[PDB]
Amino acid sequence: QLTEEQIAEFKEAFSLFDKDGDGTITTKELGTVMRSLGQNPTEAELQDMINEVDADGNGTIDFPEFLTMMARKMKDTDSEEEIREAFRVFDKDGNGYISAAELRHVMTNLGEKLTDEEVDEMIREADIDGDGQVNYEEFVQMMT
Numbered sequence: 100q101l102t103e104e105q106i107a108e109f110k111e112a113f114s115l116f117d118k119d120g121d122g123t124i125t126t127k128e129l130g131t132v133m134r135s136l137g138q139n140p141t142e143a144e145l146q147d148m149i150n151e152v153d154a155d156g157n158g159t160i161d162f163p164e165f166l167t168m169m170a171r172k173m174k175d176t177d178s179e180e181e182i183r184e185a186f187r188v189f190d191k192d193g194n195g196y197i198s199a200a201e202l203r204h205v206m207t208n209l210g211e212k213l214t215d216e217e218v219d220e221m222i223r224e225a226d227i228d229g230d231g232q233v234n235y236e237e238f239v240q241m242m243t
């Protein structure tokens with residue numbers, strides 16, 4: 100279930116999309132965030148994504164709508180290729196392992212200021228075999 104810790108974290112992630120801090124994620128914001136992650140959606144793809152999550156239909160995504168999206172547990176088979184694309188934005192050198200430096204670079208791009216203590220802790224929580232890196236298998240589980 101949702102712990103007060105998970106709720107605080109989803110707020111940090113929300114504020115990454117909410118660049119202006121106005122309390123809503125607009126199509127413009129989603130777009131600049133996706134371009135940081137090497138993606139490039141059209142104005143149409145951005146309206147559809149917002150639509151898939153926008154419950155009240157006001158064209159924007161607030162914390163409630165965001166939290167609901169994040170809270171719903173999605174399983175594999177339902178877009179396995181999407182998870183693979185996500186893995187690739189992190190595994191910059193394509194060697195199969197998300198290193199601590201690769202996670203930090205992705206976060207730097209998103210505007211997140213992270214300390215060495217924070218990058219290792221994110222790695223630690225996803226790392227299963229304890230090699231201090233995240234391979235595709237470990238990455239998949241974190242999602243599901």
Ligand SMILES: CN1CCN(CCCN2c3ccccc3Sc3ccc(C(F)(F)F)cc32)CC1
Nearest residue numbers: 108109111112115211212213216217218220221
């Ligand atoms: C002062 N303020 C303190 C918190 N830090 C953010 C912490 C970074 N990070 C993280 C690191 C270790 C363990 C937990 C967390 S909470 C968190 C939440 C969302 C994200 C996300 F979105 F990337 F997934 C990144 C972080 C920012 C500065």
Ligand SMILES: CN1CCN(CCCN2c3ccccc3Sc3ccc(C(F)(F)F)cc32)CC1
Nearest residue numbers: 108189197202220221222224225233238241242
């Ligand atoms: C079940 N449970 C397993 C692991 N936890 C944490 C996964 C680590 N994770 C994380 C941790 C703290 C705050 C935010 C984030 S976002 C994030 C993104 C990249 C990775 C990276 F780079 F490793 F892929 C790991 C994390 C999430 C779900």
Ligand SMILES: [Ca+2]
Nearest residue numbers: 117121123124
């Ligand atoms: Ca906003």
Ligand SMILES: [Ca+2]
Nearest residue numbers: 155157159160
């Ligand atoms: Ca809304």
Ligand SMILES: [Ca+2]
Nearest residue numbers: 190194196197
């Ligand atoms: Ca790598």
Ligand SMILES: [Ca+2]
Nearest residue numbers: 226230232233
């Ligand atoms: Ca590992």
